[PDB]
Design an enzyme around this catalytic site. Structure first.
Site, PDB file in Angstrom:
ATOM      1  N   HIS B  41       0.811  -1.228   0.000  1.00  0.00           N
ATOM      2  CA  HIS B  41       0.000   0.000   0.000  1.00  0.00           C
ATOM      3  C   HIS B  41       0.842   1.276   0.000  1.00  0.00           C
ATOM      4  CE1 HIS B  41      -0.184  -0.364   4.530  1.00  0.00           C
ATOM      5  NE2 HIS B  41       0.186   0.911   4.409  1.00  0.00           N
ATOM      6  N   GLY B 143       2.150   6.135   9.846  1.00  0.00           N
ATOM      7  CA  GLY B 143       3.560   6.115   9.479  1.00  0.00           C
ATOM      8  C   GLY B 143       4.277   4.880   9.991  1.00  0.00           C
ATOM      9  N   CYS B 145       3.461   1.781   9.413  1.00  0.00           N
ATOM     10  CA  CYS B 145       3.384   0.658   8.475  1.00  0.00           C
ATOM     11  C   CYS B 145       4.759   0.273   7.954  1.00  0.00           C
ATOM     12  CB  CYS B 145       2.385   0.944   7.363  1.00  0.00           C
ATOM     13  SG  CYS B 145       0.737   1.376   7.973  1.00  0.00           S
TER      14      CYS B 145
HETATM   15  N1  PQ6 Z   1      -1.781   3.989   6.428  1.00  0.00           N
HETATM   16  C1  PQ6 Z   1      -2.477   2.846   5.837  1.00  0.00           C
HETATM   17  C2  PQ6 Z   1      -3.821   2.541   6.528  1.00  0.00           C
HETATM   18  C3  PQ6 Z   1      -3.694   2.033   7.973  1.00  0.00           C
HETATM   19  O1  PQ6 Z   1      -4.110   0.929   8.297  1.00  0.00           O
HETATM   20  N2  PQ6 Z   1      -3.337   2.923   8.900  1.00  0.00           N
HETATM   21  C4  PQ6 Z   1      -2.727   2.749  10.151  1.00  0.00           C
HETATM   22  C5  PQ6 Z   1      -2.088   1.589  10.602  1.00  0.00           C
HETATM   23  N3  PQ6 Z   1      -1.598   1.422  11.838  1.00  0.00           N
HETATM   24  C6  PQ6 Z   1      -1.770   2.419  12.704  1.00  0.00           C
HETATM   25  C7  PQ6 Z   1      -2.381   3.660  12.382  1.00  0.00           C
HETATM   26  C8  PQ6 Z   1      -2.645   4.671  13.336  1.00  0.00           C
HETATM   27  C9  PQ6 Z   1      -3.247   5.840  12.964  1.00  0.00           C
HETATM   28  C10 PQ6 Z   1      -3.621   6.054  11.648  1.00  0.00           C
HETATM   29  C11 PQ6 Z   1      -3.424   5.087  10.706  1.00  0.00           C
HETATM   30  C12 PQ6 Z   1      -2.810   3.853  11.043  1.00  0.00           C
HETATM   31  C13 PQ6 Z   1      -4.724   3.798   6.475  1.00  0.00           C
HETATM   32  C14 PQ6 Z   1      -6.175   3.460   6.746  1.00  0.00           C
HETATM   33  O2  PQ6 Z   1      -6.690   2.487   5.814  1.00  0.00           O
HETATM   34  C15 PQ6 Z   1      -5.904   1.374   5.633  1.00  0.00           C
HETATM   35  C16 PQ6 Z   1      -6.555   0.255   5.143  1.00  0.00           C
HETATM   36  C17 PQ6 Z   1      -5.817  -0.874   4.834  1.00  0.00           C
HETATM   37  C18 PQ6 Z   1      -4.451  -0.863   5.029  1.00  0.00           C
HETATM   38 CL1  PQ6 Z   1      -3.514  -2.249   4.562  1.00  0.00          CL
HETATM   39  C19 PQ6 Z   1      -3.797   0.234   5.542  1.00  0.00           C
HETATM   40  C20 PQ6 Z   1      -4.524   1.376   5.857  1.00  0.00           C
END
Ligand code: PQ6
Ligand code: PQ6
Lengths: 304, 304
Positions: B41, B143, B145
């Site tokens: 992603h 951030g 990820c």
């Molecule tokens: N940045 C990618 C994102 C994510 O999970 N964000 C986050 C992942 N872990 C902590 C987070 C704490 C606060 C904010 C976002 C976080 C955004 C949201 O939709 C998705 C949907 C699927 C996937 Cl595979 C990634 C994502």
């Protein structure tokens, strides 16, 4: 989101860990520049620990009696001196992995990470706090002496603890990097009992703010209190008194959540008086006090 | 003595963390040999996350669109490929700090350490477990990820997790290092709810053995049970069923303490039925399940 008991990354400290052997005693040392720091009890036998006269025991030791090993290579000891309860062993090679560092003496309530080591080899890392009775609730086995406690500020490691002793009650005692024990402990195998382990109030409040930030809000009530009213209840529960300095330190967390510090105090007062009623806060069934207000902000903001 | 939620020393993994940017998205990557692994992603915008067709989005990306930065130096990307939900970016320089490694896919109940990173920079390290519903209760911000989960066996790092997603409930989802998600999660900003978070029974039993070893014995009772009787009570409390394999795995802890596994099961049964009654075990007011039998033996023996 999510809140964990997080330790600093340990790599910078792993690169400093050495094994120090004196005779038949082996423990850990911290190699910073051309000096290796270790507990002065490396010169003691198990019988010596009962009533050691370190100055006298040290007379029978020369530079060559201190075997310092980094990884699998031997360091040459060209000097040695006792400073309080630590020995400083001057070696002929500056540690090429020496990070930027400081030696700090922390106050009770402050948290730090420990890199537990055995034979100069790191086995694990965990977070703990300097208890108000100057003990630490660590995880240390025989051979872990010389393991250090530290905090990191970007690239500067502030070393604050060196492990020396385990009390009969399973709690731990140690020194700052100048060899001065935290609290009244002495490096002798004698009966030393810890004082009251009070709860670090400002840390519990910080952790309640972390819980609000992470969605756990059930404990927020409709009340407020005063510092004097809150402290009357805190004293009764063996909680440290809360001061205006603690309120000031919680200012940034109060601003982030919009919950005034004295309102969070009233929430804590009801938690102490009513209990958790089978509920949890940040996956805990008790009030956690080993996260400072600074640790909450760092974990909830992403300081690297 | 003492028992802490201990993570592996993170230095070996810190030396692998890089920042990967694709367009306006920046996350973490793991640089092993001449390959950088990161969540696929990284190629998505926030709008793309709603319904991404990764194969199509990837067509619009060339080697030069993936900016890989190690510390403060740029790595040259000479190849890129998608494997399941991870991108592998071939760079022209093998990581000089590459430790000995393996990519393992862990089972629920297994524990690992996470080195949370932001912009390729490690911020902290904590221990967690793969929940029976294939989520992890981590601490991840935006951030984070690309942060990885790992175990160390002396000098070999077994990478088992890469962080990708946070569910609306605050729990986390991610993949093994081959890009396959743990559980049924998909890398899309769509409603994905987690299943029942059952308690890892074998881990609770291991932690009760750690408590006995560390002096907390109050919960040891005069009873025994059978696997069938214990499991009837475990099902009622949303505890995972205990099998003969779990009993076998607890064998070494049973031998160390002299407490038969089924007697410890009976102790756990009474703990579930009666509660803690305001008491604690290893400083916890709840039954901990994120220590495997292997973690207990390692922490109580000093494996480095
Ligand atoms: N940045 C990618 C994102 C994510 O999970 N964000 C986050 C992942 N872990 C902590 C987070 C704490 C606060 C904010 C976002 C976080 C955004 C949201 O939709 C998705 C949907 C699927 C996937 Cl595979 C990634 C994502
Ligand atoms: N090894 C030095 C020793 C020690 O504290 N041991 C330990 C320290 N920490 C964890 C331990 C786990 C198990 C076994 C011993 C441990 C021995 C006992 O008497 C003393 C007394 C004073 C001092 Cl300054 C050190 C010591």
């Amino acid at each position: 989101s999510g809140f964990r008991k997080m330790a600093f990354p340990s790599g910078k400290v792993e690169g400093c860990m050495v094994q120090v052997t004196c005779g038949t005693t082996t423990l850990n040392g911290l190699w910073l520049d051309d000096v290796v720091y270790c507990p002065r009890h490396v010169i003691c036998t198990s019988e010596d620990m009962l009533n050691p006269n370190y100055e006298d025991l040290l007379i029978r030791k020369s530079n060559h009696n201190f075997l310092v090993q980094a990884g699998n290579v031997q360091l040459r000891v060209i000097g040695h001196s006792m400073q309080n309860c630590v020995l400083k062993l001057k070696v002929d090679t500056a540690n090429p992995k020496t990070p930027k560092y400081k030696f700090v003496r922390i106050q009770p309530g402050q948290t730090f990470s420990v890199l537990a080591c055995y034979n100069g080899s790191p086995s694990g890392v965990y977070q703990c706090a300097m208890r108000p009775n100057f003990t630490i609730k660590g995880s240390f086995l025989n051979g872990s002496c010389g393991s250090v406690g530290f905090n990191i500020d970007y690239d500067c490691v502030s070393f604050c603890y060196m492990h020396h002793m385990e009390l009969p009650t399973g709690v731990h005692a140690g020194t700052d990097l100048e060899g001065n024990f935290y609290g009244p402990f002495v490096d002798r195998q004698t009966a030393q009992a810890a004082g009251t382990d009070t709860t670090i109030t400002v840390n519990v409040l910080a952790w309640l703010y972390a819980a609000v930030i992470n969605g756990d809000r059930w404990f927020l009530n409709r009340f407020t209190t005063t510092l004097n009213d809150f402290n009357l209840v805190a004293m009764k529960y063996n909680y440290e008194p809360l001061t205006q300095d603690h309120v000031d330190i919680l200012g940034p967390l109060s601003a982030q959540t919009g919950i005034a510090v004295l309102d969070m105090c009233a929430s804590l007062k009801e938690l102490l008086q009513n209990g958790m009623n089978g509920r949890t806060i940040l996956g805990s069934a008790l009030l956690e006090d080993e996260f400072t207000p600074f640790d909450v902000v760092r974990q909830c903001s992403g300081v690297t």
